[PDB]
Amino acid sequence: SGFRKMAFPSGKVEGCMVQVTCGTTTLNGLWLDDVVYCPRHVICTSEDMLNPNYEDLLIRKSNHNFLVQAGNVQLRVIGHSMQNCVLKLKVDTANPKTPKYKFVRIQPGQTFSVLACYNGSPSGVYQCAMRPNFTIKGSFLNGSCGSVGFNIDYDCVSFCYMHHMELPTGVHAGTDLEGNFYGPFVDRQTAQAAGTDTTITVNVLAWLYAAVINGDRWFLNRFTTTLNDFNLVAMKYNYEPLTQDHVDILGPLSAQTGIAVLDMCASLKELLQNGMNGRTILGSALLEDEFTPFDVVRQCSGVT
């Protein structure tokens, strides 16, 4: 019992973290096999950052200009290329700690673990969600760029995020490991406003199921609702519309708890309309939306 914002164990990812220095800029790189992946803004000089021409900047750069340090051993760089907003640095040595991995571009509302790193050294791990507006609410200081988001399925690390920038509003933007930004964000120092940060309805509902399972039931009501009635309320409260796919994904929590998805929807509706009235749910005074149905099932069943 008990429910926690849990991250994946970070060990498999810790052994992939390196430091990349180009000129005077140091950030984090991810070493998988004989490739080190990092943000292409490593080639930027603080003054290039207004509108960098990365193609023009990269012409000036040779294999030997990319200093790759894995702990206190230097990697020989034998090739470099730009794929979208990441650099791939071919090194002469395959990372001996390369776990089984995949690159996956995640959907908004999906959750992952961030290993926040500085100079290729891990500082901490936390659980995040890709916000509906393709930002994440992270914890990233100067030098944290190249820190990666991942999921683990038994022994396979799915890399989904590389950290690139902080928006003027102090939310975070980044790419998948093919270097495509989540959202409309570009790797340049300019006005980038995020869109409306909507609540991930299916994740709130999953977290309400997690609460019921863990004994927090005060919010279960005598009401039900329909997908259309519910979504009228979602719309008003900047909640993502709920689909039958969402309902289906909640099926195992529904089944375990014997609370119909639409009944739980009706409990959420009352919570949105009436607030918490100074009560808490799983020690939170607001509706948590950074647990997926899969996260609830995983944590409420002991998957390793």
49 binds ligand RZG (CB under 6 A): yes
Residues 6+ apart with CB under 8 A from 52: 41, 43, 44, 187, 188
Are the C-beta atoms of residues 221 and 270 closer than 8 Å to each other? Answer: yes
Q: Which of 302, 134, 124 is nearest to 213 (CA)?
A: 302
Judged by beta carbon, residue 98 or residue 123, the one nearer its own copies is 123
23 binds ligand RZG (CB under 6 A): no
From the list 65-73, 159-167, 204-212, 241-249, the region that binds ligand RZG by CB under 6 A is: 159-167
Q: Which option in its own copies, ligand RZG, none does residue 110 bind, with CB closer than 5 to 8 A by kind?
A: none
Long-range contacts of 223-227, Cβ-Cβ distance < 8 Å, separation of 24 or more: 223/263, 223/266, 223/267, 223/269, 223/270, 224/260, 224/262, 224/263, 224/265, 224/266, 225/262, 225/265, 225/266, 225/269, 226/262, 227/262, 227/265
> Rounded to the nearest whole angstrom, what is the least distance from the CB of residue 35 to ligand RZG in the complex?
22
> Rounded to the nearest whole angstrom, what is the least distance from the CB of residue 201 to ligand RZG in the complex?
30
**Phi, psi angles (nearest 5°) of residue 62:** -115, 160
Q: Which option in ligand RZG, its own copies, none does residue 131 bind, with CB closer than 5 to 8 A by kind?
A: none
CA–CA distance, 138 with 171 (Å, rounded to integer): 7
CA–CA distance, 98 with 13 (Å, rounded to integer): 9
Residues that bind its own copies (CB under 8 A): 1-12, 14-15, 115-119, 121-126, 137-144, 166, 170-172, 214-215, 275-276, 278, 280, 283-286, 298-304
Q: Which option in its own copies, ligand RZG, none does residue 61 bind, with CB closer than 5 to 8 A by kind?
A: none
The residue number whose beta carbon is nearest to ligand RZG equals 41
Q: Which residues pair with 87 in a beta bridge?
A: 38, 82
> Rounded to the nearest whole angstrom, what is the least distance from the CB of residue 69 to ligand RZG in the complex?
22
Among 44, 116, 128, 136, binds ligand RZG (CB under 6 A): 44
Q: Which residues pair with 127 in a beta bridge?
A: 113
Judged by beta carbon, residue 34 or residue 166, the one nearer ligand RZG is 166
Among 83, 119, 123, 189, binds ligand RZG (CB under 6 A): 189
Judged by beta carbon, residue 44 or residue 300, the one nearer its own copies is 300
Active site residue 38: no
166 binds ligand RZG (CB under 6 A): yes
Active site residue 160: no
> Rounded to the nearest whole angstrom, what is the least distance from the CB of residue 38 to its own copies in the complex?
17
Of 16, 22, 38, 41, which is the active-site residue?
41
Q: Which option in its own copies, ligand RZG, none does residue 4 bind, with CB closer than 5 to 8 A by kind?
A: its own copies
**Phi, psi angles (nearest 5°) of residue 230:** -55, -55
Number of chain residues interacting with ligand RZG (CB under 6 A): 10
DSSP string, 65-130: GEEEEETTEEEPEEEEEEETTEEEEEESS--TT--EEEE--PPTT-EEEEEEEETTEEEEEEEEE-
| Lookup: tokens for 196 | 């409306």
Residues within the interface to ligand RZG (CB under 6 A)? 41, 44, 49, 165-168, 187-189
Q: Supply the residues annotated as catalytic.
A: 41, 145
